[PDB]
Design a protein around this ligand. Structure first.
Ligand SMILES: CC(=O)O[C@H]1C(=O)[C@@]2(C)[C@H]([C@H](OC(=O)c3ccccc3)[C@]3(O)C[C@H](OC(=O)[C@H](O)[C@@H](NC(=O)c4ccccc4)c4ccccc4)C(C)=C1C3(C)C)[C@]1(OC(C)=O)CO[C@@H]1C[C@@H]2O
Ligand SMILES: Nc1nc2c(ncn2[C@@H]2O[C@H](COP(=O)(O)OP(=O)(O)OP(=O)(O)O)[C@@H](O)[C@H]2O)c(=O)[nH]1
Ligand SMILES: Nc1nc2c(ncn2[C@@H]2O[C@H](COP(=O)(O)OP(=O)(O)O)[C@@H](O)[C@H]2O)c(=O)[nH]1
Ligand SMILES: [Mg+2]
Lengths: 440, 433, 354
């Protein structure tokens, strides 16, 4: 009906999938094994919502996802973990050596021999669906399994499945913090594939979440789990419209319509307003106006950009919980008068509103505190160009001296292709500078 | 299921192999008799990386001990873990090499190399997917050195997509234990530079300095040095075995570290060390661990990394740690010591974390650096080489076995070429003429 | 270390003319441009090189270069530098069917012949003219193939064993037991070339049936000697002319096979990268003495990466001269191969777009 078949590629995809499915299972009452006492207690309902799960005759509920990766150590943790009985045994793990952060290896030397089985399993999953309104692909730039396999899979899917939407949740390397010395090569290579196939790809930076967790939550020493929890909450806020009732619901096609002005500028940001700890949960009213104002605070942005150095093309808000339309209109009117948030001249509306009556859920343990309201802010900003430029400079510092090129060249990639991808990135940057200029 | 084969040639290589196997057997909970007695199932999650199963539920290690002196084999077989290795892999001859590279490369090695290659081929065929090889030898040799280089060349010719590692011990500057050391070292390094992806640098003087100044030991022996080397090797190979928040395969290390195909010599390290009595006062945290990591005295190559301008570095961490400390500490180490890093790589430090720590420690770290300062080792050998080649000090003992003079000059030219390539990325700016 | 780079386009062949093919290459002055058939509406890609050579039809009063013109541009000067006691290198590049054979060999009609026949004929004619009672000359020829960083002899019909490379401390790198034969005129420098070409390794892939798999080196060692009116007679003049046929680059996608067919290509690509970097250094070095007189530091060009450079050390550095000629296919089908060749040519003394 309203399916959102998801794919996880790479270790970042696998960990984010763990967090996301923990959140979803806690939301819908699905036990880790798969059984659902809640509907049996109710005696007839629709708690087995088709948006993320499928129901069998015996009362079990299987999720609609795949966890494709080349490192068995990443998937075997989930295979023999607490959730070992929920997923289908077809987690589709390659029994071969890792791609070692090499784009070429993840594309056409070891990424092959697996893609056929992955496409077959995706076809089997999609055959069960009368909906299939959009794909969700989670990945992290960094090469090896992630970028190369995501590029190949997106290239095949864009040909086979036609015009169905494909949202990407991509982790981006931070400016100052990195965990690989071939990350810029991999990202500059992967832009050439993500630009022409992904219909609307988000972006999240590690350093931004680190700062947000340090300041708001008073967590001195965060780990991967908190970052994955925040991304899980963001995707849940985005996809909540397709499951629960609401006064003004927005489908995936509405996102693909309103947030993208032109085909080549579909790279928005994201954030989350009531990211507040338990101790600070009190002493704050958390009205609609306050959270909506806090959405545009530069310090809370999920990617290290300065929106004051740019202009907002379009914005879409998704509120979850007791939020009546009058307060939302008042908050929008109050926000639009400030001159710090400069808007472009050719989009005088510039806002999309959405309300959902389901309040957010609290994962046990974790860090977030219960809040009776919440809002997810997505916006297209020209300032994101800056987030590319630094990365681009890194590439231009390393490609000149021909460093780490032998490994990539010895795995099927021609030397010239680099430059082509580089040129495309430059074109994208220029396109943004073409759109933000004021009309005559 | 990744899988790596182990060879050990020469006395030093065999002793290091015995200590390495006693260390890995303790980490995985393998009994001396070969049975299993552990505390958690997670140890056997990836046992295939070093061992093979047996009919009686025993576990036989994967090793090929090669040597020309039967005394070392007899000593190892009577040791604490002598019976762990299967008998058929003990291949050896007699008459020794006599600390002569020519005997151990051209005359005597040609007979035992066939058997060693047969055994290593049999072992390689049995694995599900061979990842790579490990070899241990002392350069200042003649048994381990020549046969090790010959095996390197043969294995590279036969299997050319498997990362061939090598943990080797080179001649020290001052602590000399043999008279023909520079010739063997130069020839073996020449044969080694072209046929390996990742070779580590261990110096005896550096290990002695670590034992004396840091560990505050009184009368160090060869056992402590073998312990340090075994600890470093395990750490290096850690990520293949246990899971973690972020893993570092061997090919990941190879792809990330070496900038250009030639420049593949690495400087290792291990942290922490409390010197048996300072553990009570020392606090085990990521900042202290990384502070001791980059300190010069910890380093095991006897090349101070203050004239080096580190080309690349990798740090494999073992323990349950929030990564914010790791990332911020690495960035702070980069920024505070900017003069000791190269500019045309924007950031040049890799990290990896494994959740499972070592038995008897809350957190540990293994250092794998690549800095230009290693030239100060090689150049030294080169100097001594000419000091014994201009007058032909002991050259006749090699020509007796059919070695021509040209092979020495070729090796010396390759040595100087390696030193010069290292040296170009060593001045702290170009802006010149 | 003078570097020259030339890009040539061949005319239509029989297969292209049989179908309704189109030209997608334009050239003017010293600039080349291509248009993508897949997306004609975006923009035309442009590049600048040291020489551009249009060759489609005979009259072509604007910007047509007969084989005599390109010979006078490259080969005549190269041979003149060869005679004065210096080393010379000429490189051929181009994907399968690009027409490198047309460039180097040409037809035997004695009106449109390639660089090699013209160079050999001029060499032998000059030798025959100049041979007086004092002067005397000798020429030797050898042919070899580099393949997965192993050297094999093509002229010798012996077993295809892997020879060992050595570094003589004065003469430099060389190959042990490499066949060497004496020659006296053009007829010979060919039958030898044909026999060596027949023995080259070759296989069939998805791209082409007879795609090459190894680099080929053709070495001409030229020795002079001057018999003065006394006993002190010395040669003192030994020159090397190297002609290198370079196998084309390839993607693993086009080479749709696993195992050896992949491996060869990978190694081939490595050489096709590293040589570029070396020449990319020389050109820059060449610019030093020429304009800004940068002499400080040998700026030791990295030279031992692979085997192909480590064997042509003496010919590509020092005070030698190097020419490189890249063939292009004008057919619209081979857009990616042409773009790859043009981008490779863009390296090695990059020039701005005028
Ligand atoms: C009692 C206790 O916990 O004290 C520690 C200790 O003081 C220190 C100094 C130990 C100690 O190591 C040394 O003194 C030493 C001697 C020669 C060469 C190198 C080290 C220790 O001996 C070594 C020993 O290590 C182990 O037991 C590990 O399992 C180790 N394997 C062995 O060497 C081993 C020891 C006993 C029995 C069987 C095997 C290991 C660690 C990582 C990876 C592989 C193996 C430990 C924890 C300690 C003592 C006992 C003091 C250290 O060694 C290691 C690798 O743990 C030295 O650096 C560490 C840091 C530790 O704090
Ligand atoms: N936010 C977040 N990022 C992750 C996580 N796991 C991995 N990453 C990112 O992944 C990058 C490492 O490159 P990856 O390609 O993803 O590693 P991989 O998925 O195991 O594939 P290989 O690199 O080939 O080993 C790092 O820079 C991390 O930022 C995660 O759980 N959360
Ligand atoms: N690190 C280390 N080095 C050793 C050990 N034993 C010997 N060596 C070194 O090995 C070198 C001798 O080489 P060796 O292997 O004995 O040659 P062989 O006798 O022909 O086999 C000497 O320079 C020693 O410094 C040891 O236990 N540890
Ligand atoms: Mg991985």
């Amino acid at each position: 009906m309203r399916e959102c078949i998801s794919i996880h590629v790479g270790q970042a995809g696998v960990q984010i999938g763990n967090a996301c499915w923990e959140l979803y299972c806690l939301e819908h009452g699905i036990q880790p094994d798969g059984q659902m006492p809640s509907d049996k207690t109710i005696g007839g309902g629709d708690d087995s919502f088709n948006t993320f799960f499928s129901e069998t005759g015996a009362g079990k509920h299987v999720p609609r996802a795949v966890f494709v990766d080349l490192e068995p150590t990443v998937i075997d943790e989930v295979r023999t973990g607490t959730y070992r009985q929920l997923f289908h045994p077809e987690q589709l793990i390659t029994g071969k050596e890792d791609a070692a952060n090499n784009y070429a290896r993840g594309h056409y030397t070891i990424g092959k021999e697996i893609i056929d089985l992955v496409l077959d399993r995706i076809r089997k999953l999609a055959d069960q669906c009368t909906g299939l309104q959009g794909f969700l692909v989670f990945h992290s730039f960094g090469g090896g399994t992630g970028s190369g396999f995501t590029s190949l899979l997106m290239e095949r899917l864009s040909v086979d499945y036609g015009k169905k939407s494909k949202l990407e949740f991509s982790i981006y390397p931070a400016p100052q913090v990195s965990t690989a010395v071939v990350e810029p090569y991999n990202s500059i290579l992967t832009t050439h594939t993500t630009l022409e196939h992904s219909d609307c790809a988000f972006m999240v930076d590690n350093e931004a979440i680190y700062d947000i967790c340090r300041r708001n939550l008073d967590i001195e020493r965060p780990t991967y789990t908190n970052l994955n929890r925040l991304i899980s909450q963001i995707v849940s806020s985005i996809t909540a419209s397709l499951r629960f009732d609401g006064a003004l619901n927005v489908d995936l096609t509405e996102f693909q319509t309103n947030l993208v002005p032109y085909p080549r500028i579909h790279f928005p940001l994201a954030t989350y307003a009531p990211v507040i700890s338990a101790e600070k949960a009190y002493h704050e009213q958390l009205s609609v106006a306050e959270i909506t104002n806090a959405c545009f605070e530069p310090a809370n942005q999920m990617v290290k950009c300065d929106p004051r150095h740019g202009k907002y093309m379009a914005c879409c808000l998704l509120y979850r919980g007791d939020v009546v339309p009058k307060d939302v209109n008042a908050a929008i009117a109050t926000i639009k008068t400030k001159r710090s948030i400069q808007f472009v001249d050719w989009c005088p509306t510039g806002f999309k509103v959405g309300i959902n009556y389901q309040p957010p859920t609290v994962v046990p343990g974790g860090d977030l505190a219960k809040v009776q309201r919440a809002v997810c802010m997505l916006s297209n900003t020209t300032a994101i160009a800056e987030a590319w430029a630094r990365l681009d400079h890194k590439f231009d510092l390393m490609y000149a001296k021909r460093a780490f090129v032998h490994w990539y060249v010895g795995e099927g990639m021609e030397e010239g292709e680099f430059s082509e991808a580089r040129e495309d990135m430059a074109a994208l940057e220029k396109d943004y500078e073409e759109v933000g200029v004021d009309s005559v | 299921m990744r899988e790596i084969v182990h060879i050990q040639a020469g006395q030093c290589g065999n002793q290091i192999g015995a200590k390495f196997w006693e260390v890995i057997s303790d980490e995985h909970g393998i009994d001396p008799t070969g049975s299993y007695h552990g505390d958690s199932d997670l140890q056997l999650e990836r046992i295939n990386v070093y061992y093979n199963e047996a009919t009686g539920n025993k576990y036989v290690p994967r090793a090929i001990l090669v040597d020309l002196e039967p005394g070392t084999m007899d000593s190892v077989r009577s040791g604490p873990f002598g019976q762990i290795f299967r008998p058929d892999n003990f291949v050896f001859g007699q008459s020794g090499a006599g600390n002569n590279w020519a005997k151990g490369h051209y005359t005597e090695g040609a007979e035992l190399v066939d058997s060693v290659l047969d055994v290593v081929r049999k072992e390689s065929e049995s694995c599900d997917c061979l990842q790579g090889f490990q070899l241990t030898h002392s350069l200042g040799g003649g048994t381990g050195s020549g046969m090790g280089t010959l095996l390197i060349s043969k294995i590279r010719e036969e299997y050319p997509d498997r990362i061939m590692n090598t943990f080797s011990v080179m001649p020290s500057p001052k602590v000399s234990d043999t008279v023909v050391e520079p010739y063997n070292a130069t020839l073996s390094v020449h044969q080694l530079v072209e046929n390996t992806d990742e070779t580590y640098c261990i110096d005896n003087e550096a290990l002695y300095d670590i034992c004396f100044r840091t560990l505050k030991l009184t009368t160090p022996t060869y056992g402590d040095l073998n312990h340090l080397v075994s600890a470093t090797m395990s750490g290096v190979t850690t990520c293949l075995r246990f899971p973690g928040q972020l893993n570092a395969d061997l090919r990941k290390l190879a792809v990330n570290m070496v900038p250009f195909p030639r420049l593949h010599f690495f400087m290792p390290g291990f942290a922490p060390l409390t010197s048996r009595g300072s553990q009570q006062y020392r606090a085990l945290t990521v900042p202290e661990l990384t502070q001791q990591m980059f300190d010069s005295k910890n380093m095991m190559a006897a090349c101070d990394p203050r004239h080096g301008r580190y080309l690349t570095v990798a740090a494999i961490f073992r323990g349950r740690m929030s990564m914010k400390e790791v990332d911020e500490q690495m960035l702070n180490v980069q920024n505070k010591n900017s003069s000791y890093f190269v500019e045309w790589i924007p950031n040049n430090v890799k990290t990896a974390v494994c959740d499972i720590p070592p038995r008897g420690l809350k957190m540990s770290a293994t250092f794998i650096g690549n800095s230009t300062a290693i030239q100060e080792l090689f150049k030294r050998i080169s100097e001594q080489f000419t000091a014994m080649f201009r007058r032909k000090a002991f050259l006749h003992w090699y020509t007796g076995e059919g070695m021509d003079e040209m092979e020495f000059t070729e090796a010396e030219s390759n040595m100087n070429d390696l030193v010069s390539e290292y040296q170009q990325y060593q001045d702290a700016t170009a802006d010149e003429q | 270390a003078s570097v020259k780079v030339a890009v040539r386009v061949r005319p239509f062949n029989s297969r292209e003319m049989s179908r309704d093919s189109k030209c997608i290459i334009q050239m003017s002055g010293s600039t080349t441009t291509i248009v993508n058939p897949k997306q004609p509406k975006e923009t035309p890609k442009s590049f600048s090189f040291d020489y551009s050579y249009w060759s489609h039809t005979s009259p072509e009063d604007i910007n047509y270069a007969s084989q005599k013109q390109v010979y006078r541009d490259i080969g005549e000067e190269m041979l003149q530098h060869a005679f004065e006691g210096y080393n010379v290198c000429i490189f051929a590049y181009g994907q399968t069917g690009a027409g490198k054979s047309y460039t180097m060999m040409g037809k035997q009609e004695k009106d449109q012949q390639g660089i090699i026949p013209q160079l050999c004929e001029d060499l032998f004619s000059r030798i025959n003219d100049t041979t007086n009672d004092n002067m005397s000359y000798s020429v030797e020829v050898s042919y070899m193939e580099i393949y997965c960083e192993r050297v094999r002899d093509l002229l010798n019909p012996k077993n295809k064993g892997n020879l060992r490379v050595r570094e003589h401390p004065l003469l430099g790198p060389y190959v042990e037991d490499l066949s060497k034969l004496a020659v006296t005129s053009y007829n010979d420098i060919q039958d030898l070339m044909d026999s060596g070409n027949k023995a080259r390794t070759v296989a069939a892939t998805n791209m082409n049936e007879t795609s090459s798999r190894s680099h080929a080196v053709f070495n001409i060692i030229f020795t002079q000697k001057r018999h003065d009116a006394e006993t002190n007679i010395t040669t003192e003049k030994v020159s090397k002319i190297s002609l290198v046929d370079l196998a084309g680059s390839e993607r693993a996608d086009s080479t749709g096979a696993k195992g050896t067919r992949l491996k060869e290509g990978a190694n081939i690509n490595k050489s096709l990268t590293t040589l570029g970097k070396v020449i990319s250094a020389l050109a820059e070095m060449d610019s030093g003495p020429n304009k800004n007189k940068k002499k400080k530091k040998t700026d030791f060009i990295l030279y031992r990466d692979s085997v192909l450079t480590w064997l042509l050390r003496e010919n590509l550095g020092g005070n030698s001269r190097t020419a490189m000629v890249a063939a292009l296919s004008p057919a619209d089908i081979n857009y990616d191969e042409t773009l790859s060749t043009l981008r490779y040519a863009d390296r090695a003394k990059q020039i701005r777009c005028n």
